[PDB]
Amino acid sequence: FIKPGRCPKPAVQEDFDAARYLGVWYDIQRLPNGECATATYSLSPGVGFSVFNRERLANGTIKSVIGSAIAEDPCEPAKLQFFHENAAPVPYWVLSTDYDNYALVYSCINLGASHAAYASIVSRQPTLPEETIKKLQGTMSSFGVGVDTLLTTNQDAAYCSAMN
Amino acid sequence: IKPGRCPKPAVQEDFDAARYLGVWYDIQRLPNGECATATYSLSPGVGFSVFNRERLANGTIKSVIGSAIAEDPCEPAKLQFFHENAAPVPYWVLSTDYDNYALVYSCINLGASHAAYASIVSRQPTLPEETIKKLQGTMSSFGVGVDTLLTTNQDAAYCSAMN
Amino acid sequence: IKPGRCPKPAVQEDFDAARYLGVWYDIQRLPNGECATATYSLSPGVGFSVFNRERLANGTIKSVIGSAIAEDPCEPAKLQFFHENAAPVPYWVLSTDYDNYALVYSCINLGASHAAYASIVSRQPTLPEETIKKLQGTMSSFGVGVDTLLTTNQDAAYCSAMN
Amino acid sequence: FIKPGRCPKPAVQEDFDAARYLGVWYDIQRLPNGECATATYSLSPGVGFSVFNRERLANGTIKSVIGSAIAEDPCEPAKLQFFHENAAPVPYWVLSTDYDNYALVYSCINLGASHAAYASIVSRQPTLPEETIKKLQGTMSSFGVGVDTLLTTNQDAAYCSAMN
């Protein structure tokens, strides 16, 4: 996931409301880095929220990873840090969301003169209308993400049946 | 605030977060309420959730919730603490036996100076004087002045409001 | 040390490091020697080299060399300062006209508190009272108490040992 | 330069003497990430040292980049941070050096559950004896660097003539 240049710093969702963002989200499109991916965001007894990521492996098994998400600076609640089990902390930015349909999430780490980027369009449903996807690919283009490089997540009902 | 950079003392080897859960009482701390307790719990995510309580001078219970996460899992004794409306601070478990005492350390660099927090805690409202002496020994080894240590008031009657 | 987290004030737009080089005199600063000057020079690497001088109460000149680097080149006004035997500290040029004044800021988080340094500097040993007032205005906007500001002694005779 | 797992933390050169490390170094072998590469380390009026990297581009031109290197914690003088022009800071660790012949340098950045690594065997001469290279590849193996993945730098006198 490596491109030349430093991390861009795109705009994040204004007035981000973590409470409305909780619940289940489905991956629709992502940069290259399992299928049927969902994230579930929950109340945390501490600060931030707890994260449950699930995906189907090519062999039919469900991989799952638990994590925590915390906005370090509370004045920018849309810029989080994600802590996964046995992973180092990674940035997680909610660039744009309506809370009820779509979200666009971004994550970038500097590597000298290069950077590694993760980006993802997610939805409250296993699908998202083509018009919305287009809008969000527009946003991604504005800070240099190549639309060609985007993979479509397989969210087929039958293939993803093992996710209950 | 003392001159010099943060020391980097040794941390508890093979630190077991599961055994560290539950209630701890402050026995001694560096200057920075009384009757202080911390309660560490299971977190649905990674790390554990923290509930700190203390009695204010006016009799009210102040409480703050937080989260503690070991950023590098290969050093599970070096945590980051995230409190509500606070910036993240380091939290190192230097030494613990899980059932009696712990010694916790936290230090932040300020140029040529540093700010340090240190605390002896216990599973009971009191801790034997021998154990305290041992742990003050450990603190001395990396430059903490034993004179500067305050004793936490854990008197049963004074602390009755903590149920 | 004040309660609350570090503010993040605006920095000088289109900051030109080349024009900022040369000698600056401390006029006012928050509490943390007198006759203080900083001298900024070309660095063969990136950023610039720093030579701070001050007069100690006993008449001796203390001096410390350092390096200043903008980690993110897209924000050239937000530097890191590296002094000998010190940990790195932030250094923000909030406002400067390059030929008369500058206002510099530095803040480090300590949990629910923070430690702040702020300084009004000048190209001359003095600065007009009007300019000082303007810059104190800027400081007030992000919560610096104007009362707490110390005036640096830049008296020609007292500072004669600085050549 | 991306492998799974977190950054290893190998041992660094004990009692590292920055003064002896100054001068000219030639790249002999490196992980994938120009040829004829040299680094020149110099006195810095501030703290740390100044860096001048040079290499030959495939078209015959000399690319050069200036930088600064600083040990943030002076108690670990072998763990530096490198600041290049228009680059974000990267770690630079001197794992092993004799100051007069060879050095082995390492640099690794975490990317969640993965990491990106740079490693380099350098020499005071355009070549280094095969025995020494073997020793240093041994050290690299101990913390999981695949010896197969190592590229040999072209330091041919004639091809590198443009470097004066």
mmCIF file of N, CA and C in Angstrom, chain A residues 6 9 73-75, chain C residues 5 8 72-74:
data_model
loop_
_atom_site.group_PDB
_atom_site.id
_atom_site.type_symbol
_atom_site.label_atom_id
_atom_site.label_comp_id
_atom_site.label_asym_id
_atom_site.label_seq_id
_atom_site.Cartn_x
_atom_site.Cartn_y
_atom_site.Cartn_z
ATOM 1 N N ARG A 6 4.466 12.374 1.085
ATOM 2 C CA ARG A 6 4.014 12.286 2.459
ATOM 3 C C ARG A 6 2.509 12.059 2.537
ATOM 4 N N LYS A 9 -3.390 15.189 4.423
ATOM 5 C CA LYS A 9 -4.182 15.410 5.624
ATOM 6 C C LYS A 9 -5.555 15.939 5.226
ATOM 7 N N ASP A 73 -6.945 13.509 21.040
ATOM 8 C CA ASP A 73 -7.392 14.885 21.219
ATOM 9 C C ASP A 73 -8.912 14.970 21.069
ATOM 10 N N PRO A 74 -9.609 15.167 22.191
ATOM 11 C CA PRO A 74 -11.080 15.261 22.205
ATOM 12 C C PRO A 74 -11.646 16.430 21.382
ATOM 13 N N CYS A 75 -10.813 17.403 21.041
ATOM 14 C CA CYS A 75 -11.272 18.510 20.207
ATOM 15 C C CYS A 75 -11.360 18.120 18.736
ATOM 16 N N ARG C 5 -5.740 20.981 28.760
ATOM 17 C CA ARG C 5 -4.794 20.515 27.757
ATOM 18 C C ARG C 5 -4.153 21.689 27.047
ATOM 19 N N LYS C 8 -3.929 24.975 20.928
ATOM 20 C CA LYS C 8 -3.219 24.890 19.657
ATOM 21 C C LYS C 8 -3.450 26.153 18.853
ATOM 22 N N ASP C 72 7.226 18.228 9.982
ATOM 23 C CA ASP C 72 6.361 18.316 8.824
ATOM 24 C C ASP C 72 6.663 19.601 8.065
ATOM 25 N N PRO C 73 7.300 19.472 6.899
ATOM 26 C CA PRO C 73 7.658 20.627 6.060
ATOM 27 C C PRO C 73 6.460 21.455 5.587
ATOM 28 N N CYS C 74 5.251 20.906 5.661
ATOM 29 C CA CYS C 74 4.063 21.652 5.249
ATOM 30 C C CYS C 74 3.627 22.650 6.320
#
